[PDB]
Symmetry: C4
Subunit: 103 residues, 4 copies
């Protein structure tokens, strides 16, 4: 990969490390909740997949006393990561001047 691409891929692997924390905080941030849905560690990890993608389809969601910010803060980490990759994107068309000669 190129320099700027490795920087993007480095960011992608950072997000995966947040999902781990998300899976844990998820079970804690529901065991005690008023109308809790998310229970069990081995399905909590699956909830943490369907969030950091910036797609919150539903399924399970944390409540209130749980610190609803548990979902919020995980989702926002994905925004940072998939925003950062713009450092690759704004170079993608810059390649055209290289392609022009085949530099």
């Amino acid at each position: 990969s190129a320099d700027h691409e490795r920087e993007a891929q480095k960011a992608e692997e950072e997000l995966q490390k947040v999902l781990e924390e998300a899976s844990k905080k998820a079970v804690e941030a529901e065991r005690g909740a008023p109308g809790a849905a998310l229970i069990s560690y081995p399905d909590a990890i699956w909830w943490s997949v369907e969030t950091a993608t910036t797609v919150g389809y539903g399924d399970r969601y944390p409540v209130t006393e749980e610190g609803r910010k548990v979902a919020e803060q995980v989702m926002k980490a994905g925004i940072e990561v998939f925003a950062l990759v713009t450092a690759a994107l704004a170079t993608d068309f810059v390649r055209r001047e290289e392609e022009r000669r085949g530099h």
Copy 2:
């Protein structure tokens, strides 16, 4: 510390203001609406946060008689904030010129 990175952070503060104003409006908007489901000041702010993300997740959602332009405002305000900060992101690729000179 830079120029653009300060203005990016200032945009985040704007979004928080809209959330807080949206929680006032949202409660009083829904008071009269059919379905509602969203009521009360202390959990109006909770609905407000994921509204700005445009994710929504699956907590609650507003009706028609609240004047759904309530949500439209908050949702579009979020997107424009997340967009503005590209003033910092779009200069990230440009850093690869600076590091070529090394100075």
Copy 3:
């Protein structure tokens, strides 16, 4: 103003055109289809709002016979509009180089 802010602003009008025609097609597409829930005219236009700025919280679902293409194309139109204005966002950092000369 900058040339690409007027051009960006133009694009936002175009999105609102899609909403109009969406509101109309939506009632036809749903009214007659099995499983349909949209139906009424003034409640069609209010579904043709948030859908175009993605979200997903249209507060309704299309089915298959409506031609899910009716929702799909409205959502995609929003992407083209809000993505087109990226040309304005990209010249935001460029303004830095003017700052550094005070020009």
Copy 4:
């Protein structure tokens, strides 16, 4: 005919391919899972379509034993093709030099 529009448009052409592959997977993925929703085959493509546009809307949902990476793979596929188009889009501030020159 603008090489960046060719590369951008070509990206969308692979998205369609992933939809067909993934819709085969999605229905066969869901089949076996507890609490399966997405059991339909000629409809599976319509769910796949809105999954690629990263919305979900509120039609169906995948379960656990589907291997919710089937759903997630379609989402990331959509993001990378559409985010690649940011090449052409991030070019469109640069076209302002030729605009300025008048030819």
